[PDB]
Design a protein around this ligand. Sequence first.
Ligand SMILES: [Mn+2]
Ligand SMILES: [Mn+2]
Ligand SMILES: [Mn+2]
Ligand SMILES: [Mn+2]
Ligand SMILES: [Mn+2]
Ligand SMILES: [Mn+2]
Ligand SMILES: [Mn+2]
Ligand SMILES: [Mn+2]
Ligand SMILES: [Mn+2]
Ligand SMILES: [Mn+2]
Ligand SMILES: [Mn+2]
Lengths: 252, 254
Amino acid sequence: SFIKPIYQDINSILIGQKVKRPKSGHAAGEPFEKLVYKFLKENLSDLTFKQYEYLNDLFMKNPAIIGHEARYKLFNSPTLLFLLSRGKAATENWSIENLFEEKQNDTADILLVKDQFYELLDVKTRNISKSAQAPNIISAYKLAQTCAKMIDNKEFDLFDINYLEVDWELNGEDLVCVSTSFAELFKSEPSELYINWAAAMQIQFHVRDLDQGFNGTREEWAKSYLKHFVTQAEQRAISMIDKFVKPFKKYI
Amino acid sequence: SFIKPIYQDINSILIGQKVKRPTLSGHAAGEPFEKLVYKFLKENLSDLTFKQYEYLNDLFMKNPAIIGHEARYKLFNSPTLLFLLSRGKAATENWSIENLFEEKQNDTADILLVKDQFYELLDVKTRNISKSAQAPNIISAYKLAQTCAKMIDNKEFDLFDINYLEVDWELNGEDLVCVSTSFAELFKSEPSELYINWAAAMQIQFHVRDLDQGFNGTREEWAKSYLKHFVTQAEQRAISMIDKFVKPFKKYIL
DNA sequence: GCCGGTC
DNA sequence: GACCGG
DNA sequence: GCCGGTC
DNA sequence: GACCGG
Ligand SMILES: [Mn+2]
Ligand SMILES: [Mn+2]
Ligand SMILES: [Mn+2]
Ligand SMILES: [Mn+2]
Ligand SMILES: [Mn+2]
Ligand SMILES: [Mn+2]
Ligand SMILES: [Mn+2]
Ligand SMILES: [Mn+2]
Ligand SMILES: [Mn+2]
Ligand SMILES: [Mn+2]
Ligand SMILES: [Mn+2]
C-alpha cells in the first residue's frame, strides 16, 4: 500500500471534518470520499488518480496509437485490463475532447500508481449511529475472475486491493467523521470471506473486522479463494432449491 | 389505481420543470422529482397520500392504548399488508410519540395511497434519459413470491395494488429538468414474462415505459402463475450457477 | 438481439 | 452504494 | 458472535 | 437505487 505509510496522518485530518446533510438508499457519505482524494492528492499528488483520471492520462500520453485494440495493449496486463478498462465503444471513441468520466461500476475509487505497481483503493462510509449489516465490498465473481487471470498470466506482483472505512455520525445539520479503518484484501484469510449471493454476489465485511493474518504467498491466496468460491457456489445452488423452491411447490 | 385518474395532471406538472443541481449518483439526482410527485399528491389527493412510515405513525397514534408489538401488529388486519408494510419486532415495540418511525431504505413503497380499505403501493423510479442503461431494480422477486403465497393462503386478492411511475430526467446546464413519464401496474402485466435478475438482489427488472399491460386473468391467477414462474426460474438459476461459477473454475482447484 | 453483472 | 432483523 | 435479503 | 456492454 502507498496509503498505509500515511494512514495515521489522514486518520488525523479526517476525524472531525464536517460535511453538510444532503438534499433533506445510497451515498450521502460521498463527500468524505472526495475529502479522502483531496487529502491524498496533496500528500501523494503524483501517485493519486480517480480510476477515470488514470485512463485519461494513459491515453493522453499515447497520441500515436488509436483504435481499441491498440489502446488495450497499453494496459500491458490482462488482469489490469479486466479490472480497470472501459468498454470497446468507449475506448474506441476516447479523445482529448471526449474523456472518460465517473462510471458507477468502476472497480476502484482511487488508484495509486508507482513504478508499475497498482493499489486499488476503495472507500466505504458508515453511519455509526447504528448497528448495520456489513456493506458490499466487491463482487465475489469479479474476484474469482481476477484470481484466475492472475493464475493464468502469473501476475502475482502487480496490484493490491485495499479498503478505507470512514465512520461518521449526525451532529446537528452536518455529518461528522468520528473514526477510520484501513485493511488489505490480500492480507485476509481468503477462505473466510463471506459471500452474499443475493446482494450482487458481493463479499461483505466491515473494514475494521477484516482479519489481516494470512501468511501464504499471493498465488496461494488466489488458489484458496477459487476453492472457497466454487464451494460456496455449489452450496448456494443447494440452498436456493430449499429456500426458493421447496416452500413454494405446494402452490403449483 | 388512485393515481391513474390524475396521471395527466402529474405529468403536466413534472414535464419541463427545472431543479438546481446538488457528481449526481443518479439516485441523488432523481430524488427531487420524487419530492415533487409526493407534494403534488399531498395537496390534491391529500386525505389519502402517505409516505410508508408516515402511514405507520398515523396508524399507531390513532390507537394510543395499543402498546406492545403483537397488539400493534393486530392493527393491520391483514397478513399480507403486515408483511409488506411492517417495521420489525424491536422497532414496533420501541415506537412512541417521542420516537416516531422515519424513512427506512428498505421500505417496500415510496408512497402509499389508500381509500375505502384499499391500498395502492406506489413506487417512483427515476431515469437519467441521457443514457441507455439496463432495466432498473423494481422489486425483489422473493418478496413478491412471499406476497403471492400470503395472498393465496389468506384469500386476499382485492386488497392492494403495486404501481410504478417512471420519471425521466436529464442534465441541462446547471439544472435537472424532467422530459417524460410513464405509469404501469404490476398486476396488469404477464407474470410469466417478468424477468428475475438473481444476482441483482433477486430483483424483478423492467423499464416502466414498456412492460406489457395485457393480462386478462384474475389476481388469484396472477399470484399462482407468478409463483410457478418464480420456482421454475430458481431451478434454472441453481443450474446456471454450476455452469457459470463452478465448472469454469474447477481447474484451478488443487 | 438477448441476457445479466456491479457499485 | 450501504442499509438491521414480523 | 453468526447469517443474509432490499432499496 | 439505478446503473450499459473488454
Ligand atoms: Mn433513497
Ligand atoms: Mn476488437
Ligand atoms: Mn458514485
Ligand atoms: Mn454510486
Ligand atoms: Mn466505488
Ligand atoms: Mn466509495
Ligand atoms: Mn412476538
Ligand atoms: Mn423505494
Ligand atoms: Mn424515496
Ligand atoms: Mn423511489
Ligand atoms: Mn452483534
